[PDB]
Amino acid sequence: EGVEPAPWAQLEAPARLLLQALQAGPEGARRGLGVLRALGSRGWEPFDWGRLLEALCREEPVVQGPDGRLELKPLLLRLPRICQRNLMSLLMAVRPSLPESGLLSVLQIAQQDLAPDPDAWLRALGELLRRDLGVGTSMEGASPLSERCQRQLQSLCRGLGLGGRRLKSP
Amino acid sequence: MAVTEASLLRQCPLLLPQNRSKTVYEGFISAQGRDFHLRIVLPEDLQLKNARLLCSWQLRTILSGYHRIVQQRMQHSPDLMSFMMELKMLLEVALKNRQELYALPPPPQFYSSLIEEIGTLGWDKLVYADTCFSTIKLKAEDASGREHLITLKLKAKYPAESPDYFVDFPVPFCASWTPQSSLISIYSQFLAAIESLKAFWDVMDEIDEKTWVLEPEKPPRSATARRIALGNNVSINIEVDPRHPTMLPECFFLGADHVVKPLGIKLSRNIHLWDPENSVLQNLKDVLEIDFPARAILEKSDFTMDCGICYAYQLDGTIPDQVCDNSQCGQPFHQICLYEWLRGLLTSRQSFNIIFGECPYCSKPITLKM
Amino acid sequence: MAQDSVDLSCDYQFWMQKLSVWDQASTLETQQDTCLHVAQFQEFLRKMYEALKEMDSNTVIERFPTIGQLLAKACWNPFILAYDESQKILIWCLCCLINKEPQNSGQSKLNSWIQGVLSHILSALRFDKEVALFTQGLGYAPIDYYPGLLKNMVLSLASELRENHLNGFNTQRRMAPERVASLSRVCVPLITLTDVDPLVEALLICHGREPQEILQPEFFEAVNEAILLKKISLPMSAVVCLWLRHLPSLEKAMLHLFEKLISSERNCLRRIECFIKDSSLPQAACHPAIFRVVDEMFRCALLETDGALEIIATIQVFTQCFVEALEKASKQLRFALKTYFPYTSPSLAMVLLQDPQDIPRGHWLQTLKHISELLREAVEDQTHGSCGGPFESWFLFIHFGGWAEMVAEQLLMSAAEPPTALLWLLAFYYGPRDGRQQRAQTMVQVKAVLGHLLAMSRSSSLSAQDLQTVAGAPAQQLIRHLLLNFLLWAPGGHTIAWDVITLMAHTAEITHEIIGFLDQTLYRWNRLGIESPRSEKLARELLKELRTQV
Ligand SMILES: [Zn+2]
Ligand SMILES: [Zn+2]
């Protein structure tokens, strides 16, 4: 009746194993790295990031919020929140060997443009991946942090004698 | 429009009301250039809590895996118009997901032009093409004499849009695609990337020749790390930058705490002597003031004897003991790790003190007795 | 001694009109709102306690109108009566309202009512019936089983969470998330009760398989405040889990480190190190998400101020801690440094990680002279396949103390024929974003200054005005720091240090700057085990006397 299958049920077995590993708390990202060396070791030495980053954007339906509202979510927002955070950490780790076309489709989801109740950690890891590609200078105040934190940190640094270095260039 | 008198026309044109009292609609519903048969009978009043909705078997097989959602939406949805909007949205999703089974290209542009372009390339290059003609894969050679592949994935419109290019080598590959460009264009870009990355390949090939590389085995071309072995029961891992390979790498040491310390010390003291005009090996040998072994054991190189969940030996006294009943996996585990793993999976079933499940790596029956 | 009633008499009506809404908190919204406002209620009660304490009962009618109703509503709400000291203060207030010698019957009724509410607080059986019957039969009172009962409820719930966690995607009873959120609301008032920490630790470790959070951020804010004030003492796995599922709690932790270096413990780097090590941030910053967020905040601060020595020294300390935690607990499967420091060439970091404890004191020069080469290449030859810019190479180079600070002290040792690469490094340290035309002028100024200082050192013990001449711009902090290193190094010092310090310390900012310099220098020496006791005692005395002037 109320049995729910795992949202990585229909995926390629190695991807399934990776997403099973990342589930496991803060040691999820290290375990993701161990998984990738344990597939470099096996018969399929390459790992199909380009297939996983399509599956991460593929949409399926859910009914959340009120009793009745149909909405379409991608995988990245449908799989467990610690799998999410340890994913994006692992994509920071292996960014150079990833296709940009897939990454940008992922980062657009992570940005969560026009959503209530966002994931601050997903948005922040989005920003930190954009900055590392070099397509998210963005000409904004788009920083990983909150406006609250950035303001409370201006408020304290104001109470300190500014240094003779010149790092901002007017 | 607001009312369901013109908004319904504009958003489902091929639904014709049979009856005067607009209660029986019949006809076709559109989704991604495809019309599906549909007959949607209401009761005497305007209520969807109970209604009939029959389909063609094409549409039923295409709405496989969403029947519950549609049934729920029939009861939850106020109006017919919004139900049709949701149904079109859902169809678009189903088709875009199962894009494999549902498609047809425009041959007069497609099938001929791709063969024309592959002839423009030369038929010594191409090595693979899929029966849907979606995937193709091409080959090229280095001046050093190395084979390097490039996978393309093509859409219904190949020349209109960019084709998805998948390539092994580690730096992100950038291909300026125009609608006027073609396979020779992207192939020239591929050869350009090859001749650029020549130096990195040379370094990693020299390592793979003259050292007992340990834990990548048959490494890909994307890999920048190479855990080299030296002496006995100590190794050094080495990550290399493609743009600046000959420059100093991030490097460190695994093994015995009493053996490793002088190596870190000697590295710290000699690290200023690195020079990016020689080779990595020819710099490492005079930095660490040692020579390497060339496959001191080539058969029993190493079998990772760790938990295969936590990747550690010695979790809280426990040892890797629980293994796979399989010749191809043989992967050890711990009781605790494997219990926490198997208690999750849906396949697993627990008797009194026994859990049967699938081995994580190979998905074969594995038994755990607590 | 101005108002004495008005603000308190307003807050009174506020609180009584809030208690009446709350009313035993048998729902979600009452519970959340209580969990928000309870702290201010505690302070309100302290002020009310002072007010009723200084005066006496039954004579005065200031707030005696509804004080009864207030203290009752407080008492029958258990989210209040389980917060830190709220129960103790409500007891105090009821003790103040009592009277020894009642005269009118109303005061006797009051005293009876006070005994009643006190009895409700301490000793009423508002629990399941049969357990009270059974215990009363066996001759056990509530005080000699409630502890074990609590203990057993807590273990039960904690096991249940663990089993709902292990049963991820399995055909079994799923702990309803209403219950998990309920427990998370209950943990908030009684976070400082030792008899509940298992339930906290279990809630943090047992994230489970949901896409949304089931706990609400009041839980996380509560736990974090308690972790940082040392009132709960969890293990490290749980505070990492906390950071890593509530990002504002990790920002709020890193701010609580900045108050310690801005306000409280300016230039007591031993105390900064003690706070950092007791905190879990080094251990937690081995997850790259957390190291990236931490460096982003360090960056914001390096920029708001224009290169504050206090933030610089704090970063150096943090980085040392983080390194000696990464080494400890990154044996198998460790992340590559370009994952923590992604904005630079890995070569440079792999040089700068190498500690100078490991190297002889004489071979520091060669290593610095090599680092200068790599920074110069990375800045000046800014071509594709390199750093993002000069600021990035600087911000890295600053993370690794020892090297950045040792520069001047090696210039003085080689002041005869100064190395141009060290001059370059020093000018880079005290100013990036300058350009070669500026850098050359800076370096030649420094070279002339080194000539004069070497002349003065190889001369006898001379005045302070001869030094103030060369001290007399865009290169002032550099010359100040170089001159301080001259004082500590040369044996001509420990005689005329005061004469120069007094002249240089015009303002308080220069005083703070010199204090920071000297604390950093002693931390550095005591760490590397390099010391001349003359310079140690000299610097300690100057620091002691200047910390009074500020
Ligand atoms: Zn294990
Ligand atoms: Zn197996």
Swiss-Prot record, chain A:
Coiled-coil ranges per UniProt: none
Localization per Swiss-Prot or TrEMBL: Nucleus
Post-translational modification: Phosphorylated. Ubiquitinated. Phosphorylation by CHEK1 induces polyubiquitination and degradation.
Top-rank taxon, per record: Eukaryota
Self-association state and partner proteins as the record states: Belongs to the multisubunit FA complex composed of FANCA, FANCB, FANCC, FANCE, FANCF, FANCG, FANCL/PHF9 and FANCM. The complex is not found in FA patients. Interacts with FANCC and FANCD2.
Medical condition linked: Fanconi anemia complementation group E: A disorder affecting all bone marrow elements and resulting in anemia, leukopenia and thrombopenia. It is associated with cardiac, renal and limb malformations, dermal pigmentary changes, and a predisposition to the development of malignancies. At the cellular level it is associated with hypersensitivity to DNA-damaging agents, chromosomal instability (increased chromosome breakage) and defective DNA repair.
Function, as annotated: As part of the Fanconi anemia (FA) complex functions in DNA cross-links repair. Required for the nuclear accumulation of FANCC and provides a critical bridge between the FA complex and FANCD2.
UniProt-recorded name of the protein: Fanconi anemia group E protein
UniProt source species: Homo sapiens (Human)
From Swiss-Prot, chain B:
Modified residues (N-acetylalanine): 2
Top-rank EC class of the record's enzyme: transferase
Positions with a binding annotation for Zn(2+) 2: 324, 329, 359, 362
Enzyme Commission number: 2.3.2.27
Reactions that this protein is recorded to catalyse: S-ubiquitinyl-[E2 ubiquitin-conjugating enzyme]-L-cysteine + [acceptor protein]-L-lysine = [E2 ubiquitin-conjugating enzyme]-L-cysteine + N(6)-ubiquitinyl-[acceptor protein]-L-lysine
An example molecular function term from Gene Ontology annotations: ubiquitin protein ligase binding
Subcellular location: Cytoplasm; Nucleus
GO annotation terms (biological process): DNA damage response; DNA repair; gamete generation; interstrand cross-link repair; protein monoubiquitination; regulation of cell population proliferation
Keyword Transmembrane helix recorded: no
Role this protein plays: Ubiquitin ligase protein that mediates monoubiquitination of FANCD2 in the presence of UBE2T, a key step in the DNA damage pathway. Also mediates monoubiquitination of FANCI. May stimulate the ubiquitin release from UBE2W. May be required for proper primordial germ cell proliferation in the embryonic stage, whereas it is probably not needed for spermatogonial proliferation after birth.
Assembly, per entry: Interacts with GGN. Belongs to the multisubunit FA complex composed of FANCA, FANCB, FANCC, FANCE, FANCF, FANCG, FANCL/PHF9 and FANCM. The complex is not found in FA patients. In complex with FANCF, FANCA and FANCG, but not with FANCC, nor FANCE, interacts with HES1; this interaction may be essential for the stability and nuclear localization of FA core complex proteins. Interacts with FANCI. Directly interacts (via the RING-type zinc finger) with UBE2T and UBE2W.
Free-text note regarding domains: The UBC-RWD region (URD) region mediates interaction with FANCI and FANCD2.
The protein's name in its UniProt record: E3 ubiquitin-protein ligase FANCL
From Swiss-Prot, chain C:
InterPro entries: FANCC (IPR000686)
GO biological processes: cellular response to oxidative stress; DNA repair; interstrand cross-link repair; nucleotide-excision repair; protein-containing complex assembly
Disulfide bonds: none
Record keywords, A-Z: Cytoplasm, Disease variant, DNA damage, DNA repair, Fanconi anemia, Nucleus
Keyword hit for Cytoplasm: yes
Annotated tissue distribution: Ubiquitous.
Subcellular location: Nucleus; Cytoplasm
Oxidoreductase listed as a keyword: no
Effect of residue 251 to A: No effect on protective function from mitomycin C-genotoxicity. Loss of IFNG-induced STAT1-binding
One CC-aspect GO term: Fanconi anaemia nuclear complex
Disorder association: Fanconi anemia complementation group C: A disorder affecting all bone marrow elements and resulting in anemia, leukopenia and thrombopenia. It is associated with cardiac, renal and limb malformations, dermal pigmentary changes, and a predisposition to the development of malignancies. At the cellular level it is associated with hypersensitivity to DNA-damaging agents, chromosomal instability (increased chromosome breakage) and defective DNA repair.
Subunit structure: Belongs to the multisubunit FA complex composed of FANCA, FANCB, FANCC, FANCE, FANCF, FANCG, FANCL/PHF9 and FANCM. This complex may also include HSP70. The complex is not found in FA patients. Interacts with ZBTB32. Upon IFNG induction, interacts with STAT1. Interacts with CDK1. Interacts with EIF2AK2; interaction between FA variants and EIF2AK2 may lead to augmented EIF2AK2 activation and cell death.
Task of the protein: DNA repair protein that may operate in a postreplication repair or a cell cycle checkpoint function. May be implicated in interstrand DNA cross-link repair and in the maintenance of normal chromosome stability. Upon IFNG induction, may facilitate STAT1 activation by recruiting STAT1 to IFNGR1.
Entry protein name: Fanconi anemia group C protein
Organism annotation: Homo sapiens (Human)
Organismal lineage: Eukaryota, Metazoa, Chordata, Craniata, Vertebrata
Gene transcribed to yield this protein: FANCC
